[PDB]
């Protein structure tokens, strides 16, 4: 996967947003932008040129499931890879993620090795 691939980290808490960014840097990814919620994310995606979205589940205005759904139904970024970050491997939440078209899900707190595993499975799965 191209190391200058552009990431968008979406979370309502600035600390988690920073953690994820540092983790992506530990993995050799430095082209990263942040967003505070679903709405803010859709707005930033408009700029285009994004190759990856990592998003949290719980957020005001627009949560992660809704952001994912909007991404998928958007004919111009419809195939953009999206990794859902969740605080619990909850049965009902994992199905929703799967059916909504998520590229995968990861339970926080997560490690850098876990993230790499998650990224590679998605890259591999999409021939990246």
């Amino acid at each position: 996967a191209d190391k200058e691939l552009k990431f968008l980290v979406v979370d309502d808490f600035s600390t988690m947003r920073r953690i994820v960014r540092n983790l992506l840097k530990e993995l050799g990814f430095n082209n990263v932008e942040e967003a505070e919620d679903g709405v803010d994310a859709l707005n930033k995606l408009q700029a285009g040129g994004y190759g990856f979205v990592i998003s949290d589940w719980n957020m005001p205005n627009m949560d992660g499931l809704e952001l994912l759904k909007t991404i998928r139904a958007d004919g111009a970024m419809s195939a953009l890879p999206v990794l859902m970050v969740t605080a619990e491997a909850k049965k009902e939440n994992i199905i929703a993620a799967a059916q909504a078209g998520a590229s995968g899900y990861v339970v926080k707190p997560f490690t850098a090795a876990t993230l790499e595993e998650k990224l590679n499975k998605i890259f591999e799965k999409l021939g990246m």
């Binding site: 491997a89 049965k91 994992i94 199905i95 799967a98 059916q99 998520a102 995968g104 899900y105 499975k121």
Partner: protein
């Protein structure tokens, strides 16, 4: 009840997929083969939902469902 069968799994995938199945339902008669995993599903979860979940890891063609 019904039977699920998972094939051509790589190293680690048997445990990983057993756990993944855990989060979604209660499995009985679990059989952990070297690169395969089979089990009896209670029926409380729609099969399509399962496929969608396991596909976070494997491919659909590696998943099969059948009556016991």
């Amino acid at each position: 009840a019904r039977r699920i069968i998972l094939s051509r799994l790589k190293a680690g995938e048997v445990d990983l997929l057993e756990e993944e199945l855990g989060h979604l339902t209660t499995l009985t008669d679990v059989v952990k083969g070297a690169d395969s995993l089979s089990a009896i599903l209670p029926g409380d979860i729609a099969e399509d939902d399962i496929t969608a979940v396991l596909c976070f890891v494997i491919e659909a063609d590696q998943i099969t469902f059948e009556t016991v």
